[model samples]
Target: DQLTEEQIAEFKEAFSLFDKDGDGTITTKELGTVMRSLGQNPTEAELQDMINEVDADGNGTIDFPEFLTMMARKMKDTDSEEEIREAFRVFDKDGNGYISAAELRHVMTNLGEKLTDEEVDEMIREADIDGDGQVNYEEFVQMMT
Candidate 1:
């Protein structure tokens, strides 16, 4: 989305509003203040759920990249029921909605756990149901979780 100067200013204002300490990140308490400012008091569990959705670095805080990705995801309005959404995204190299053998192999090698082509083929075979020769999101989630 092409944003106007006004929109950019508004975004900066909102980010600054939650970044109470001006530390370039928002803590869990700061996030709560955001909801509180909106007159919608979020429960502890709800806040943690929001944090988990945006805390990509596992740092217990939301930084610029995390905030950007979360906002961009909201704009796209996509969601997954699977808890392994991040894992699936990391492995689904082509974003083609399926985890092909090639993508799996790439992910394995990147993780420093390189596997032979035969091993990669076997891995796909174990998860690729319906004979499509690739693992769909549901199949991947099932295989992992």
Candidate 2:
């Protein structure tokens, strides 16, 4: 799934706020209010268009399932790239644009849980696309996907 359970839960919480009537659907007006609360100043036309995009039933409202689908698409569009970059940064501690074996081992061992050398080596082998014994940014992105 594009969204984890925790992510879905978070979305559900947001959805409830938008669904002020608790009717399992968000009307254009409700959506506009929530959007404004989040500091988004959407025109009425813009709000209508946004609702149209996610209103799968063409009912002029966003239901829970439709909201989930929209949220999944939104996360895929916005979160993946930056999330991968942040994760790669954690592994590439020296900021040398690569994750060496030693770097990986250090992270794996020093973090909350520890990994054996073999496990760490296996991860590097799987992600080191160029066989250079290290993972570059591109390789890290590929491995993440």
Candidate 3:
């Protein structure tokens, strides 16, 4: 599936919603915080499981390559694993293995609104469960579920 400029932009913004720290990586714990902030609030156990499903490196985190592989697979339902992996790797603009907050924010900022670092932090704090610094992917998934 071709992710439109707008849809891709939305995805990037959504990624930021999960990525709070402006860093380029997302840990399981980070995903949980992200989900919670978005009103999903995934439990630790759930977050871990989701990581297993998507984290190809078993690094307890979901980075851009893996995410793109899954996204391409999900979006098109026809991409070969190799093709998807390549696309995902390419999609990971920062070359940081995963999608970072800065990359996501780049997408968000390009869309229209200019988000501040403090504003993003405050947003996740409002929903974060562990009281840590940033939002993770599980919390983001729960918001959807």
Candidate 4:
């Protein structure tokens, strides 16, 4: 069925909202604040649910490219849950929707593994949009996928 005019408007409105950075991709750093902004105000339980929902790769920690793709798909109302799953799976080599600081340090060292606390802070600040202690799959997929 075609979307109702209201649905279409809602879709447009949602898309406009998630495009937080205006970079066309929803980076991980902005996940929490973005969710709250969207009125999700996700609880810890909800947070874990989101983790399972988007972490296709299973390695944990939503990367950046994935963030944009999912957002775009969501906007079009053409999203297939499976497509997102595959994308997450592609990134989560270990198939766990959680990226640890150490793992990031190990894997990302090439890009700048030697990052000091400040460097790490910058990375986290970028991804920790909600000012919460951590980012969830929604943020991760947008940031890394």
Candidate 5:
């Protein structure tokens, strides 16, 4: 499946952070920096290939839309286990390998979109594949994107 609207919006927000020069596109230089900052250090060839794969116009850079499209496609039908785990780590506040209802509420509230208790419960119901009233990393990633 493709990314949800919320996931796309979050990605766009992140892209804005990477586009530090206020340019519309993420150049190779910027992409490299982003990778480094994210704690990945790919070889120069790998970086170039990543750009070419999503450059869309062979422009040697990635625009936000293209980056979104590329990422959504890459994430479709496949969950990169390590990446998903790392992302889940952010919301699993207590790091007990689960996201409790409280944790979910806290994140939503912190994001400036306060959710009522009912809404939070409903969201958990949707993603709680085990019906355990808590969300596992797999379920969290599934629901988020």
Candidate 6:
């Protein structure tokens, strides 16, 4: 599948950080440095292997397009359903298998952009498919889509 502009933009930002020297390419050393900073301890062999896998031009480094390709591959391996479930868990703070209006209001108000109770209620009303005033996993998935 084709990557969206947002995805490309985000990848570009990440690549810039990893490129270090502002060389527009990520060498094995650069990759190792970034990965190490992120708590990953990759060996020289592993670093070279990563570069080899994504270095389309056989340049022994990762260019912007190559970095995008690597990120696309990484994104492809992510489990979207699990991601949605994890997000739902964030709202279902009480672990009751559903997100109550109170829980939703608390999460929305405390995290990221603040929302009023009215706005939170509206969001719950839209996603509370059973009219039970709460969002279950299935309804949460539908709302996300």
Task: List the candidate 4 regions with Cα displacement exceeding 4 Å.
Answer: 1-5, 27-29, 58-145
- Separately for all candidates shown, the number of backbone clashes (residues 3 or more apart, or on different chains) is 0, 0, 15, 31, 0, 0
Q: Please write out the lDDT profile of model 3 over residues 1-145, one tens digit for every residue.
A: 5766775654455456555455546677766554433334355776676789866688776675554454444455434564445444544777778966575666556622544655544445455634254347576445434
Query: Which residue runs of candidate 5 sit more than 4 Å off their true CA positions?
Result: 32-44, 54-58, 76-80, 84-145
The model with the greater lDDT, 3 or 5, is: 5
- Angstrom error of the Cα, residue 22, model 3: value is 4.3
Highest-scoring model, TM-score: 5
Cα lDDT tens digits, model 1, 86-131, are 5566566677777767767776676335456445434444543231
lDDT of 2 by residue, 15-118 (tens): 56555455777777766554443333457887676787866577877777876776566444453455456555656667798887786776666742555644
Which of the predicted structures, 2 or 4, would earn the higher TM-score when compared with the native? 2
**Predictions in order: lDDT:** 0.54, 0.58, 0.55, 0.46, 0.58, 0.58
Q: Worst ten-residue run, lDDT, model 3?
A: 33-42
**What is the TM-score (0 to 1) of candidate 3?**
0.39
Q: After superposition, how far is residue 91 of candidate 4 from its true place, in Å?
A: 40
TM-scores for every candidate against the unseen true structure:
0.38, 0.41, 0.39, 0.29, 0.44, 0.41
Cα-based lDDT at residue 90, candidate 4 = 37
How many clashes does the backbone of model 1 have? 0
Measured on C-alpha atoms, candidate 4 has an lDDT of 0.46
| Per-residue accuracy of model 6 over 1-145 as CA lDDT, tens digit each | 3489976765565455555355786776766654443334456887777787866577777777766666566555455565556656666666898887786777566643555644543454454322111347675455545
